[PDB]
Design a protein around this ligand. Structure first.
Ligand SMILES: Oc1csc(-c2nc3ccc(NC4=CC=C4)cc3s2)n1
Length: 431
């Protein structure tokens, strides 16, 4: 110390001001003004929704929730499998500083109850197939006073859709392109309450999404903003890996192709036909594609990268997948729910097998001795600790669990074993 604290380089672009709502609003308004720019594509049903459509419905949902009465003292739950509609109430609530709690749509009723007992939402957005579970949770959590169906146009089984709800509360003359997103304190207004014994609520201020948005547009730590870039994401939107890659893709103006049910031929054909440049996989899908022999039958010449993951993958698995996809390697990244997003990212092209990446801008990371907490040195194995502005502000009504994890020095103890090498690539040791 000082040379055993690994530091992230400066951001290519300075850190934008304003809330996460404001930066999303600003970027998506610009993309909305180009007709036909695609935001999301559902691979199963083949429908595209454009930035204009997405911007206007999100702005309308923002103003409708504001006029309903929701403010920074309220939370919503968005409970739905990955869908064209998922990010509409997410964006609307961020535009007005209402915290959003994504609800694992393959939670059973009990997992659902505990998730929402922590987040205490006033309004629930849910897909049709989640409705009866929400209703049963409402019997035990009557703070849920309003339930809105996401994947309907008309009312559904007595409940308003997002479209009928918006119509009920927009003022006459509402103009989507005059709407101004709320300004408020970036550090103290919670953007997301993510789920991590029993899961905890992880409160993430807007600031931490604003920092992710720096990483997402970064030419080294994210993606170059280039027109007609398309992503294939098969990662759940309600978990932090899918939440904050997708928001970053929206701020980049990318086309986000989604699948909520993995199928081998549909995935490969979607890579081919949508000329996908980046594909996102959960760890166990890497093992799957290590076994796949169909990859050669598809034109994947546009494929530039495959990114992971919660994980970390084995070095052997990542090398086998990379070979099959005729790529030089896998672009890994590492983070926890409590760090918002990845705080260790494989730099563009700076690719190394088994490595999880380097420290991201605004962060620092070290490896401490498992017995003493002392800062270790190159290739020394110990506990990974990270410090930076994407760390959560704490667990929700659980300051004891918060303090076990983050000291007064603001260092986050990942509970993972790690080491960094000569060129400062981090590796995670599997326990
Ligand atoms: O558990 C948990 C919560 S958040 C999270 C991750 N976020 C990212 C983001 C990017 C990435 N890889 C970049 C994308 C170009 C390489 C890997 C990961 S892993 N994991």
């Amino acid at each position: 110390d000082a040379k055993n604290i690994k530091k992230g380089p400066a951001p290519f672009y300075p850190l934008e001001d304003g809330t996460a709502g404001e930066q999303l609003h600003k970027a998506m308004k610009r993309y909305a003004l180009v007709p036909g720019t695609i935001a999301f594509t559902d691979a199963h049903i083949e429908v595209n929704i454009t930035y204009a459509e997405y911007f206007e419905m999100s702005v309308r949902l923002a103003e409708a929730m504001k006029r309903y009465g929701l403010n920074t003292n309220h939370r919503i739950v968005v409970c739905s499998e990955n869908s064209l509609q998922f990010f509409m109430p997410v964006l609307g609530a961020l535009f007005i500083g209402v915290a959003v709690a994504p609800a694992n749509d393959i939670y059973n009723e009990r997992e659902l109850l505990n998730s929402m007992n922590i987040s205490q939402p006033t309004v629930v957005f849910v897909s049709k197939k989640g409705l009866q579970k929400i209703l049963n949770v409402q019997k035990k959590l009557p703070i849920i006073q309003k339930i809105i169906i996401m994947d309907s146009k008309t009312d559904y089984q007595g409940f308003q859709s997002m479209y009928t709800f918006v119509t009920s509360h927009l003022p006459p003359g509402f103009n989507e392109y005059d709407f101004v997103p709320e300004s408020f304190d970036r550090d103290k207004t919670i953007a997301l309450i993510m789920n991590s014994g029993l899961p905890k609520g992880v409160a993430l201020p807007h600031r931490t999404a604003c920092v992710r948005f720096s990483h997402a547009r970064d030419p080294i730590f994210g993606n170059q903003i280039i027109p007609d870039t398309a992503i294939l994401s098969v990662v759940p939107f309600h978990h932090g890996f899918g939440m904050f890659t997708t928001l970053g893709y929206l701020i980049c103006g990318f086309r986000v192709v989604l699948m909520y049910r993995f199928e081998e031929e549909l995935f490969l054909r979607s890579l081919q036909d949508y000329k996908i440049q980046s594909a996102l996989l959960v760890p166990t899908l890497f093992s799957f594609f290590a076994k796949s022999t169909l990859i050669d039958k598809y034109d994947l010449s546009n494929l530039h990268e495959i990114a992971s993951g919660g994980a970390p993958l084995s070095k052997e698995v990542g090398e086998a997948v990379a070979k099959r996809f005729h790529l030089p390697g896998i672009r890994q990244g590492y983070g926890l729910t409590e760090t918002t997003s990845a705080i260790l990212i494989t730099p563009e092209g700076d690719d190394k097998p088994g490595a999880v990446g380097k420290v991201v801008p605004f962060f620092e990371a070290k490896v401490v001795d498992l017995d003493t907490g002392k800062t270790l040195g190159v290739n020394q194995r110990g506990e990974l600790c990270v410090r930076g502005p994407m760390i959560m502000s704490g667990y929700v009504n659980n300051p004891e669990a918060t303090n076990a994890l983050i000291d007064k020095d603001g260092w986050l103890h990942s509970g993972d074993i790690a080491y960094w090498d000569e060129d400062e690539h981090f590796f995670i040791v599997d326990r």
